[PDB]
Amino acid sequence: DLKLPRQKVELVAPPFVHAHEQATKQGPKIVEFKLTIEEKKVVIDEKGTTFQAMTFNGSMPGPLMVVHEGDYVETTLVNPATNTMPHNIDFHSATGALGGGALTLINPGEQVVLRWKATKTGVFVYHCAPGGPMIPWHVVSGMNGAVMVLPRDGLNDGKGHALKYDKVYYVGEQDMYVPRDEKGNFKSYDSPGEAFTDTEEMMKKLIPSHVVFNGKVGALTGKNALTANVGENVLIVHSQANRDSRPHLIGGHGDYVWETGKFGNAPEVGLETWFIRGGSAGAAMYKFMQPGIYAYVTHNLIEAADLCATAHFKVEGKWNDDLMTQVKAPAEIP
Amino acid sequence: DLKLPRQKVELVAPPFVHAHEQATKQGPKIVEFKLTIEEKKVVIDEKGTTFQAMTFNGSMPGPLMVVHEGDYVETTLVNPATNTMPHNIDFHSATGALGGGALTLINPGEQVVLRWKATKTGVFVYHCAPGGPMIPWHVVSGMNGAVMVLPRDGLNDGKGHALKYDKVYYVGEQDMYVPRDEKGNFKSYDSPGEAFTDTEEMMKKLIPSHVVFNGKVGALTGKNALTANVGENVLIVHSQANRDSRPHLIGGHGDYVWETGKFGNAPEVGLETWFIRGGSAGAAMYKFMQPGIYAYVTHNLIEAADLCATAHFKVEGKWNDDLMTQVKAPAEIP
Amino acid sequence: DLKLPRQKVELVAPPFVHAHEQATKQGPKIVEFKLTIEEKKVVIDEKGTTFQAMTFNGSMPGPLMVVHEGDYVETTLVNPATNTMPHNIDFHSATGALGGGALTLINPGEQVVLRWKATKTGVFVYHCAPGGPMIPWHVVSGMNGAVMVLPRDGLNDGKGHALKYDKVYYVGEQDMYVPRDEKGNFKSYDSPGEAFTDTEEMMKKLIPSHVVFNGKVGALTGKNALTANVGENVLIVHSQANRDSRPHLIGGHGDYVWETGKFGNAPEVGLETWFIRGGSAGAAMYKFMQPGIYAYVTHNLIEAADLCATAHFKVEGKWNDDLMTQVKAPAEIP
Ligand SMILES: OC[C@H]1O[C@@](CO)(O[C@H]2O[C@H](CO)[C@@H](O)[C@H](O)[C@H]2O)[C@@H](O)[C@@H]1O
Ligand SMILES: OC[C@H]1O[C@@](CO)(O[C@H]2O[C@H](CO)[C@@H](O)[C@H](O)[C@H]2O)[C@@H](O)[C@@H]1O
Ligand SMILES: OC[C@H]1O[C@@](CO)(O[C@H]2O[C@H](CO)[C@@H](O)[C@H](O)[C@H]2O)[C@@H](O)[C@@H]1O
Ligand SMILES: O=N[O-]
Ligand SMILES: O=N[O-]
Ligand SMILES: O=N[O-]
Ligand SMILES: [Cu+2]
Ligand SMILES: [Cu+2]
Ligand SMILES: [Cu+2]
Ligand SMILES: [Cu+2]
Ligand SMILES: [Cu+2]
Ligand SMILES: [Cu+2]
């Protein structure tokens, strides 16, 4: 009865984002996505700690979905019979029925199809929300992601100038609550159900054991470092479904930042550190001016260095000695 | 010596707000309020946990006081002889003498009358502040509320368009610190004085046992759900006197949000989640587009689902299938 | 090879700031600063608790450095042979090499000279960042400060009006993690190295034992209270290198606030409480309207009253009874 063109999207695993246009001359479409729920035991640190994860599409965070204002987003959610619990999905971008949660509850072996219209621009969290105490548990187990709703004319700086990014990365931050046993070692469990009681007691004390980007300590380092070149404008979309974060690009800045993540508001300029409110996504863009390694962290440094929340960028290009120079290398005090 | 008309206001218990005009053609007046302090033992959860509360007017939060810019606010504070401690009041809206705290200290059996001029627009916290370690203790025991200072021309969106609300609710969030005994059960006490030592040890660890709206788990649910109709513009004023909050309307948005709560600043538009800094009030307005149940939470979901911080709205009207529709109900995976 | 005038600055201990111009007709210069690292055991509370501090120039926070946009900042960092650890410096104001950290690592007995161009206006954190788990440890041990980069035309309100301050204070907030022994008393250590293991276990639980301004409970009270007069416009620069803060002037307001601390963005007006994101500095200006004592706190009141985070201002001048008056002094309830 809704007669618009349909467009399928192939989702990609974070931190990458599926191909999309920024400004577009296409009119509204129905954009179709499929998410499949996967419950699974995963390793979250280099010491081999395990965790009962629950995920959209097998990843933490779930994939970024990108559409334009006025599109209709049609999502098929699938809960395979290999899963043990009911799940649903709530989009913060959507209007009514608890963001879709009241219409998408599915047992193992079931699927559902929800359509919502993208009336509000920005980046938005989506997450599972099955009811009661299950809501935080599914979220901190990894069932969250984000959706970016672009203006049809693309991003602007609030003073009439277009802002175009050369690439976009999605960094999903996850607070994790892994109980310890009497000796002080992290416990492992055979099922999410068995993890539940001990995990809930710890959750209610509000202190995470780990805070990670892309699901694991070191996920966005080494071979999997983010990349750019001097002169490239990079958009970083950052979500946190449950707890605040304070992103910071070490050696860089946020040239244009939407910290509340909504493109109806002009961005702030020239930030050192920005703030992502728990239950929200934000976006920052930076044009790289210098080559080398940058670290992207939450600037609670204990969380960054000791609990897992650090990514790297490797940037290629030519060093600018006007911006920064070692005048005198380390030497003995005269 | 100040010769203006006087107007008495009858305060009402939150989440309701006393009757007031938005835009007004009245000039400045002296607006007169009375607050009576009540210390009392209250039940804060459905398991029957008790708490030594200290309150303005018998409620947590204290009532919302509404005036216009340039009014003089004259408050009579009364500390009846049935109370055991000295109290005072500090308004964040007021200028000088620690917001009035240095002029309003009263023992049981005493009253005081303070007048302050409302020179700054917005929503503002008020709270008891008797001195030293007593300050946090009285605040987290429930002695806080808010005052809304409207522009004489009412609210605007910062682009010259009037914003008028059809109704306003006041949601006061309270972090509570209830000690546990050796077995792990919540302790009960005979007086606020006796609760003091154990409560202070726990407070300094910074983790609340409960986080509640309107004084109790479930206070704004069931028969006491907030209400609206499709098409109504509702203002939600949210205060937190001690600890940050991240309000979120599940299934809705903040169409216009003053997250720092001050109407000299234009509102932000189209937010999913906003942030109320500890020691502040903010305000968000939303026009309901869909009927059904909405939940208003802090989007730390552990706090929302497990520690008490969830309210409901029941919205009447007609479902809009253009905004959202279940394309295919839950069914077996083909 | 860079041929500009050189200007030496003599740094002063916080909360004071070295002499500088707001608006200037000078062109770019190379401004030269020297920081000397001092590791030392210090007393942080009135009960005599000690702490293994690590500092720039012997103070917590390190001194505020003030320059103008387009200046080149040339810093000599000195790590004397009396220190035990390597140190470096990272400026959030600077571009490349992890803010300078990758170019400034020095062992005891060494110095280094870094130059960076001040391309972004605002207030910015600087801090030590030696690598890995050392990063949070050096920061929460006291190795942080701030640098203010002014526009050449001085500050403005975003509507074309100049904002000039009559004085500026720098308040550095420090979260400290002091372990307790079995009896429940704070432990003392002989070296930062020996403090490391116990301090790290406590840090990772994320709850500070103390939160202080200027290095010590009560540092900015009594004889060392901040001062102003009625009619004076005072700028307060506030930094927090690791953990969020929510500054509030009790009895006053923030007339003009840059809470993200960056002068490319217009200030917000008329705030009660503002928010400093961990890893950032912000700035607020207020014109005092009333004499007397004001307290400047973080409005987590437990932190303010019980953990150390309270400063005082003593303001001289004439009381304005129009703004506030005690109509009726405390008296028996009729
Ligand atoms: O960046 C958004 C900000 O820019 C303004 C102009 O100052 O409006 C621009 O962006 C709007 C939303 O994308 C466009 O609809 C408008 O046409 C464009 O000028 C502000 O209104 C807005 O807050
Ligand atoms: O919403 C406040 C915001 O709007 C502006 C206009 O952009 O001013 C409007 O609101 C002021 C405060 O209410 C009024 O005094 C003014 O007349 C009206 O245009 C901004 O100045 C202000 O930040
Ligand atoms: O306060 C900064 C804010 O003011 C505006 C004008 O609204 O620009 C002013 O400040 C700029 C940065 O200092 C100046 O370069 C400009 O000349 C001056 O009008 C905004 O553009 C800015 O966000
Ligand atoms: O070893 N169990 O707590
Ligand atoms: O039972 N008292 O801790
Ligand atoms: O007394 N040592 O924990
Ligand atoms: Cu789920
Ligand atoms: Cu949500
Ligand atoms: Cu009191
Ligand atoms: Cu206060
Ligand atoms: Cu160091
Ligand atoms: Cu840093």
Kindly list the distances between the CA atom of residue B180 and the CA atoms of A208, A294, B193, B208, in Å, as whole numbers in the listed order: 22, 46, 17, 12
- How deeply is B293 buried, as exposed, middle or buried, from its count of CB atoms within 10 A (0-12, 13-18, 19+)? middle
Q: Which of residues 193-212 of B touch A (CB under 8 A)?
A: 207
Q: Which residues in chain B are classed under CATH 2.60.40.420?
A: 6-153, 167-192+205-316
Kindly list the distances between the CA atom of residue A225 and the CA atoms of A214, A297, A315, A319, in Å, as whole numbers in the listed order: 12, 13, 10, 20
Report helix, strand and coil shares of chain B as percent, to nearest 5. 10, 45, 45
Nearest CA to ligand 5 atom 1: B181
Q: What are phi and psi of B54, to 5 degrees?
A: -130, 125
B161 carries a ligand binding annotation? no
Q: How many CB atoms lie within 10 A of CB A27?
A: 11
DSSP B180: B
Q: Does B290 contact A96 at a Cβ distance shorter than 8 Å?
A: yes
Q: How many residues are listed for chain B in this entry?
A: 334
User: H/E element holding B21?
Assistant: none
How far is B260 from B264, CA to CA, in rounded Å?
10
Residue pair A123/A66 in contact (Cβ under 8 Å)? The answer is no
Kindly list the distances between the CA atom of residue A77 and the CA atoms of A20, A105, A301, B333, in Å, as whole numbers in the listed order: 22, 9, 37, 10
How far is B15 from B172, CA to CA, in rounded Å?
8
Please work out, in degrees rounded to the nearest 5, the angle formed at the alpha carbon of residue C183 by the alpha carbons of C179 and C184.
40
Q: Does A241 contact B331 at a Cβ distance shorter than 8 Å?
A: no
**CATH number belonging to the domain at C6-153, selected among 2.60.40.420, 3.10.580.10, 3.40.50.300, 2.40.50.140:** 2.60.40.420
Q: Does C131 touch chain A (CB under 8 A)?
A: no
Domain B167-192+205-316: homologous superfamily in CATH: Cupredoxins -  blue copper proteins (2.60.40.420)
Q: How many residues are listed for chain A in this entry?
A: 334
Q: How many CB atoms lie within 10 A of CB C328?
A: 12
Name the β-bridge partners of C310: C297
How far is A124 from A140, CA to CA, in rounded Å?
17
Q: Are strands B247-250 and B292-298 parallel, antiparallel or unpaired?
A: antiparallel
Q: Which of residues 266-285 of C touch A (CB under 8 A)?
A: 275, 277-281
* Residue C138, helix vs strand vs coil: helix
Sign of the alpha-carbon torsion through A50, A55, A57, A59: negative
- C213 closest CA partner among C98, C318, C296, C90: C296
CA of B247 to the centre of ligand 1 (A): 25
Q: What is the maximal distance between C-alpha atoms in chain C? A: 82
Ion ligand 7: residues, CB < 5 A: A 87, 128, 138, 143
The answer, yes or no, to whether the previous bond of A15 is cis (omega within 30 of 0) is: yes
| C330 Cβ contact partners less than 8 Å away, ≥ 6 residues apart | B105, B106, B107, B110, B111, B112
* Experimental approach taken: X-ray
Q: Which residues of B touch C313 (CB under 8 A)?
A: none
Q: Does B94 contact C324 at a Cβ distance shorter than 8 Å?
A: yes
Q: Which residues in chain A are classed under CATH 2.60.40.420?
A: 6-153, 167-190+208-316
Q: Is B161 a catalytic residue?
A: no
How far is A248 from A268, CA to CA, in rounded Å?
14
Question: What tokens were used for C151?
Answer: 């526009």
CA of C161 to the centre of ligand 3 (A): 10
From the CA of B266, the nearest ligand is 2
Q: Does C92 contact A330 at a Cβ distance shorter than 8 Å?
A: no
- How deeply is A34 buried, as exposed, middle or buried, from its count of CB atoms within 10 A (0-12, 13-18, 19+)? middle
Kindly list the distances between the CA atom of residue A334 and the CA atoms of B210, C57, C79, C109, in Å, as whole numbers in the listed order: 60, 18, 12, 9
**CATH number belonging to the domain at A167-190+208-316, selected among 2.40.110.10, 2.60.40.420, 3.40.50.620, 3.40.50.300:** 2.60.40.420
Kindly list the distances between the CA atom of residue C89 and the CA atoms of C92, C113, C145, C221, in Å, as whole numbers in the listed order: 10, 11, 10, 30
- What b/e string do you get for A112-140 counting C-beta neighbours within 10 Å, with b at 16 or more? bbbbbbbbbbbbbbbbbbbeebbbbbbbb
CA of B264 to the centre of ligand 2 (A): 6
Residue pair B15/B226 in contact (Cβ under 8 Å)? The answer is yes
* Residue A301, helix vs strand vs coil: helix
Kindly identify which residue of chain A lies nearest to residue B255, measuring between CA atoms.
A120
**CATH number belonging to the domain at C167-316, selected among 2.60.40.420, 2.40.30.160, 3.40.50.2000, 3.40.50.1000:** 2.60.40.420
Q: Which residues in chain C are classed under CATH 2.60.40.420?
A: 6-153, 167-316
How far is C252 from A237, CA to CA, in rounded Å?
37
